[PDB]
Amino acid sequence: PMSTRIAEATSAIVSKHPAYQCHVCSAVLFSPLDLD
């Protein structure tokens, strides 16, 4: 994996501290509210 390579690659460079109805469309409705 790319990530694994990148890791190994940097790990060698590391250092440490020393010791209803709608007339518009003609559709039929059922509620006055359903109309509005």
Binding site: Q21, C22, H23, V24
Partner: protein, 49 residues
């Protein structure tokens, strides 16, 4: 005497047929105070200010 009047509206509305049989023979809507009072203007129907 029964009269069937339309509800005024402050906005465009679709129209639909209405069959009437009784009308007055002279103005009598004088008791009408104002239509759509809370809106800017009446678009359709009787407009009274």
């Amino acid at each position: 005497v029964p009269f069937m009047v339309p509800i005024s509206s402050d906005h465009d509305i679709s129209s639909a047929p209405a069959v009437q049989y009784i009308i007055s023979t002279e103005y009598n809507d004088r008791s009408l105070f104002c239509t759509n009072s809370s809106s800017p203007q009446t678009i359709a129907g009787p407009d009274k200010h």
